[PDB]
Amino acid sequence: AITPEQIAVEYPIPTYRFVVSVGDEQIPFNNVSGLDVHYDVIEYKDGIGNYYKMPGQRQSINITLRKGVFPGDTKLFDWINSIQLNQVEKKDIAISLTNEAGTEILMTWNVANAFPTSFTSPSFDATSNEIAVQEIALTADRVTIQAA
Amino acid sequence: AITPEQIAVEYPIPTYRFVVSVGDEQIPFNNVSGLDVHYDVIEYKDGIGNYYKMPGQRQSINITLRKGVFPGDTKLFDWINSIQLNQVEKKDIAISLTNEAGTEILMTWNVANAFPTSFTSPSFDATSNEIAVQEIALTADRVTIQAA
């Protein structure tokens, strides 16, 4: 016998229920990926056989969000189309694993100072049975994980 | 209970119903893809640990249109065969997601100053059961989205 409260404390979390906040606005998304952190390695060897390894510089964070195409909605394209020369509005992004009903947060991924670098429009195929899906690519500085 | 006017407002749009305008003329196409926008990233680092990222230059737009082979029709090949040395007629291209009957536009992709760079003829296979399909590749300047 296992109580639902025990499951909420000891069991792992699935991936399909999440809510994404872009800036100060919340937008429903179909897919989010790329929240990785990488470092370089600095090595040093010497004549008598020593071998030193240290962490290097952290690389930049790259993110791809996938969304369907809805009538009258062009928010994501309007963001990437606002780039003038090298100026763009940078937004913080939060992705949270959520209660099955959406009223409770379980884990939060925080992304700071993200701006778009690429936008992919849907491919128009006359033999397909899918939904038009747009994709946006973002470059950011930092990623942090906060436990609720 | 969900009313059809609710679906037209809240539900996402599929990909299989679209109309393509090439120049001032409309041509039925089977597949359209490649309407993407890309930017470069310019980075700057300093000795005290700062790290700046900015959008760079926008890249050029590439588009491929796929169409069947019809009797007496060579319009797409005639366009690419009109190149003299570096002069060719550039045309604007609009791809619109359409009402199921074609009497109403939902969303438009506008492509400016496109000219052909490649043309692929159908492959003649004696064991196949397909339709002869030609493909044309275009280079453009800009892509915009207008919501109807």
Added chain:
Amino acid sequence: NYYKMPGQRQSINITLRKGVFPGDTKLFDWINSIQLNQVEKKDIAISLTN
């Protein structure tokens, strides 16, 4: 400003596939007739037929 123009046209490469029939070596004879840089050039037409 940003200007784009067509450039030079590239060369055309074509592959033909055919079965092997008794006593027929016509295709191999054509490629075996190259001397140093001389070869007989032929026009080729492919027509969709009734």
Added chain:
Amino acid sequence: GARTLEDNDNWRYIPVRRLFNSAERDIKNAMSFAVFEPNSQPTWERVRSAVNNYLYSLWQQGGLAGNKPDDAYFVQIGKDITMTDDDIKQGKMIIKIGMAAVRPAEFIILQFTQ
């Protein structure tokens, strides 16, 4: 001197009056394909694309005032926005275009001091 015969905030300068004359002619030639076409929404979208494509090109050349195209021009066309049921039934298609022109510097003042 570059002033016309009317002293008004509009059409005071020859460049502003002549720019609008050129834009009206070029736009009229741009969407002249739409005459004797069905008077439905798909035609209206095609006309809007033709006008917007021209206005962006004019702004790129420097003929309009504004840091971004949204500040230099706007195009409106649609039902209950530019035309009503009576206009459509009469065969009329109505478009609104609004563009901002750049006005030159005319007086130069030098202030001298010791």
Added chain:
Amino acid sequence: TTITTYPGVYIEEDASLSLSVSSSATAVPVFAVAGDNPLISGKPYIRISNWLEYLTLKNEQFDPANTLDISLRAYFINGGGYCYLVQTTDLEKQVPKLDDVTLLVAAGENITTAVSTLCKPGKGLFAIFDGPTTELKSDGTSNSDYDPNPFAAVYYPWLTADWTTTIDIPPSAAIAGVYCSVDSTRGVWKAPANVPIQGGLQPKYPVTDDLQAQYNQGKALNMIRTFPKSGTLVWGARTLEDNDNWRYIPVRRLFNSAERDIKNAMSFAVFEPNSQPTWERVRSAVNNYLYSLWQQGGLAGNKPDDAYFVQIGKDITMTDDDIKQGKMIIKIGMAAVRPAEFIILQFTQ
């Protein structure tokens, strides 16, 4: 000249001044103005963007016999940004109407009552006073009339320049310009002292180390002194309260700026559902700002965990009664860096 008829070049020979203007958001002062001034009469407040705008609105030549004119010239020549002019009697009524005002500057007036009312915890205001116009009393009782307010500071003595007459420039006007320049250059956490005073401004009276030793504790006075090689400098960064907290101007003013910036950062959460998803969004916004502030160098600590912390949640910061009343409570604790003030040289052979 001012009447343009023909196209071409116009020549005029004027003598109007021309200065430069900076932009600091954390230093937006309000200048107390005497009610007898014709410019301010009949209006609640006047916003001045630069010296050009002030001269245009004045419609008069620069008068060194006007206390308000010299104060604005001293303020703008020192790098100050746009400011507000409010009559002294209307301070307690018009200051709360203005939202971006951070400094309350006494441009030679008496604003003792306004400071005791406006400059309170949570109001996000800082006051700049004027020191005595006479010589400093050696008994240490020249600061008895100032309230021990941690939100105010006093500067002595008054300043003079080449363009001076029987009236001397109040030190508050020049100091408020220093606040704008330091904040835009080195940040609000850096002490607004040990910096030159621009222009030809000079202290009216000389202050030595012995004189300043009496007025550097308790209700401390900040001196403006001249040194043999560095010119005229601001020598002092202490508020009117001598406590382990708010002893120094930078610590008090940094918290004022952070409270305002955090308040603006999470103002989107008002009139939102008072549930946990909202609380997580607010925590993300506050943590994002605090990390950025630590990155700039405004907080003390080798890692962010040593510089700040944010707590919000049920049974951590609020109870059932708080939630049912519509209250959302967050705790923020940030460590400020305190400057080195005394340098001791030990010589030996």
Added chain:
Amino acid sequence: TIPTYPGVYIEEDASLNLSVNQGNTAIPVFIGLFSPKNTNSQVTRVNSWLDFTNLFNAGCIAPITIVIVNYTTSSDALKLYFQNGGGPCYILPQLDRLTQGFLDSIPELIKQALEITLIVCPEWDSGYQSKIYNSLTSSLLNAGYFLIADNQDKNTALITEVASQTATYYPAVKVSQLIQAEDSQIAVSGYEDAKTKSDEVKNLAQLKEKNPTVYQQAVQKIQAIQDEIAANGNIIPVSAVMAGIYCATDASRGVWKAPANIVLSGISDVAERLTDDEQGEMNSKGINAIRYFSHKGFVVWGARTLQNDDNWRYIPVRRLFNAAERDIKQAMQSVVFEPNSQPTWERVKSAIDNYLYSLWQQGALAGNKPQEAYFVQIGKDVTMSDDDIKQGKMIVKVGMAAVRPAEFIILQFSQQ
């Protein structure tokens, strides 16, 4: 223009139109001194700003009765309503003098138009607004109608017949300029002389060419009005602006979201600058404030109603229940003449349960599971009795739970 030849015509003008929005849960009715282009007292549906100008004469001068003239803000208030996201609306023009017969007929006229949800009176006159507000009977407001009102004072709240169904806002807003109309667009009636009947003069243009003496009589009143409005500033009632914000918020976020923390557009300044302490007094009394913030601009900073209790204190809570009972009533109208038997009651319960579940899915209701968000009850010995059934009655009980907004956020700072 009148087109003759096929082709392209070119016109130079200054006419302005705005984008048209749509909605169902927020359709306001405007009562004021409007000037319809047609003589024929009845509520008229207007789909957009272009439709309004096609059916009404836009301007700041009310129709002239022969002389007296009146100043009206109805046209400018409607432009603000469309600029803030408003959709289709109904217009109830009041003509001639304000008779009690018109006031008594207002609740019946509104009920005749079946799509009305909001009531707005966009008039600057305080006495005129007070008469209209008092004409809204408690039966009309309790039937699922919401009143947006303009408070004329900072210290005393408005009094209406139903406190739960009213929201007041303060202060009014200013605009850069007002809409000016040509002489041919200003309605004139009542003129008569020996050679002309009373119906031969329709506007100011015809009046000018028929009798310059009384024309100079009218234009001096018009010029006096224009001078007076210029001195005090072009002040517009804020209720019309709030109607558009209600439409925009419902379409974007939903009815359950408070219509606050939204930036106003198309305005220039507020009629009065408020402090936090003054706003504190008003909020307790139930007066929402339009505040100015440097980092935002002009925003709505209140979501309370005129009733202060744990049930109907907040606008989103009150408006959500109005939307739920309206949609439930619409579903229940297909059961009205069905036989009063148990299979009919089962179909009623299924219809309400399906609607309430859909409401909970979007986040309108509170709770982690549907059992915590709503309940439906109907039965032969649970809600109605044998006498009720024999009389043709059908009684169903519905309960819902709503989410209250967060109004105060407290920061607690520590040194270490």
Added chain:
Amino acid sequence: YTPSVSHRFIASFLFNNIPSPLDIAFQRISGLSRELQTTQYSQGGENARNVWLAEKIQHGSLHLERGVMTVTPLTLMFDRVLRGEKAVYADVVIMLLNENSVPVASWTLSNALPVRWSTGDFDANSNAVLVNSLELRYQDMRWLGVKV
């Protein structure tokens, strides 16, 4: 501290205090440098330190690259000088533009003398634009602006 990109710039030539409006677009402009020539001096008993003596200041040259286009006043000036006619001077202002076409940094060169004009190769196998290369030598350099 935000740095500036190097792909948005303008150059203006003044001939007899009349700016040339058709000579503002260039593919490349070389950087401008100033050097203070110095000679190292060594004392008698000083064997551990160095002494550097200041001298005159040496200015660099101005290099521009541009495609082949219609004849402009800048071209006519260059042709006249390189045809053996009397030498003539020009004043050049180089401006670095931001996203609002406001020159954040600007350099003005006094009395610039055309000294070289070269063109690219006529290559039958290439896919490239014929580019002219211009070089000038000026007497003085001065920079004005808020950035440098």
